[model samples]
Target: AAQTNAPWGLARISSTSPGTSTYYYDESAGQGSCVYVIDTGIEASHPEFEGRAQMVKTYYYSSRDGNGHGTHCAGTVGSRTYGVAKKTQLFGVKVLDDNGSGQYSTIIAGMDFVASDKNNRNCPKGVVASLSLGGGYSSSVNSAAARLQSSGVMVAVAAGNNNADARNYSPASEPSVCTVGASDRYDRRSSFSNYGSVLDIFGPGTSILSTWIGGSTRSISGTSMATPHVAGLAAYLMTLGKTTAASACRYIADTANKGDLSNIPFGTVNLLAYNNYQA
Candidate 1:
């Protein structure tokens, strides 16, 4: 089950063999799922996306990617070259800005649009949204994301990079959202990634090489990198009609390669994210 390589995170998630150096997926890897990248924005024209990445909603300065963060995350989800869900439609719902910052209201607004997209259209496989940005604990943001999940959208959030308990954050702390922490190629938590019981899963986040602004590439690290991998996994599952947010979360958690990571914190779930699953 190994195919193309390059984006180490993709190869890391698809194969379980030792030193997994390949990433092979079925041609239909992303046939029936839609992923909303709720971040700054995405460059739809980026060759990495192969015309599948689009910006459907924007709450920022422009329709194109103002910052490169969202672009990187989107590529990690389903880009032709650096994606996890190879053919899934990637939509951008701009919430943050060029400075990589946003108001709490802006974040909620983006989630609202994502919820509406699924509810209004009644998507067959629901939808998946990745929020790689987080603020301190905010009841309003938490409730909004919770309601979004209930509205048939799986919200995946970053567990922050402060190396603190994710319980102190907002969407990451919200039990309704699927919080993801960062791990390394060695199956260990990233030194700067937040932990605690709030984190639902861990994915490759260190030195992740993904698409960037100006149609180039950059290798970065953070929970921001890991969150999209989890979101992509959700998208991959939904391709098989795994739509229920609750079931989606359960399936991913239950199927993950647990206890493989040698250094998860005591309270952390220690679930290493993987994509080999069944409907």
Candidate 2:
């Protein structure tokens, strides 16, 4: 029942295409929701994402992805082929440079933009920030995520790739954010994924294929890849009138396929967006 060329992660969540699915109480397919990729910028001219991606903010005054990371994550979050919520609109908030390196303060500036631009100029319903970049723990980022959550914006973050306790990381350790780790197609935790109490969910991250820069496609791995799946899930929930950050979080937790992970503080589970999966 999987869509042709659909990512296995998406198929595992639910094989029914969003356009055809009638399972959700309200199946809008994320039409009114927006997902912000807070990393390198997106390829604005990418054919796969034509008419869907908007360059909303640029921290260092550049909105191009010299580093393909952002484009890949954006595709996973909203593009037609690789996405969980295909109709969800996309916003690019560039925080990293060509080297995929950025300062902490720059990310904070990006967060402030999403928090203030709630009038649809940037994102109609504000946003769910998909943060695929992380380095250590920062109190400022945690505080900012909490503030955004209070304002009804869901923040889905990548638990760092260091393979250590995620409690020692920033947005992962942060409360009110959906901190995601990596899992494989077989429902096993990726060897490099960070774990522990701070990790909130898992998503397919190993050898994941998504849109890349210059209208290309590539396969990449990391908790970075895992985070956007949760981000897309949040957007899909939003289209169903689950607008609050808390509501999105609870819906995701309640619907997740528990006890899938072999390593965790609580036998953590990966997200299966639809609860009606036959497996």
Q: Highest TM-score among the candidates is held by which one? A: 1
- Score each candidate by Cα lDDT: 0.84, 0.76
Candidate 1 error regions (>4 Å): 119-123, 277-279
**Which has the greatest lDDT?**
1
Task: Look at candidate 1 and give me any clashing residue pairs.
Answer: 3-23, 3-24
> What is the TM-score of each predicted model, taking all chains together?
0.95, 0.89
For candidate 1, which ten residues in a row score worst on lDDT?
A: 117-126
Could you tell me the TM-score of candidate 2? 0.89
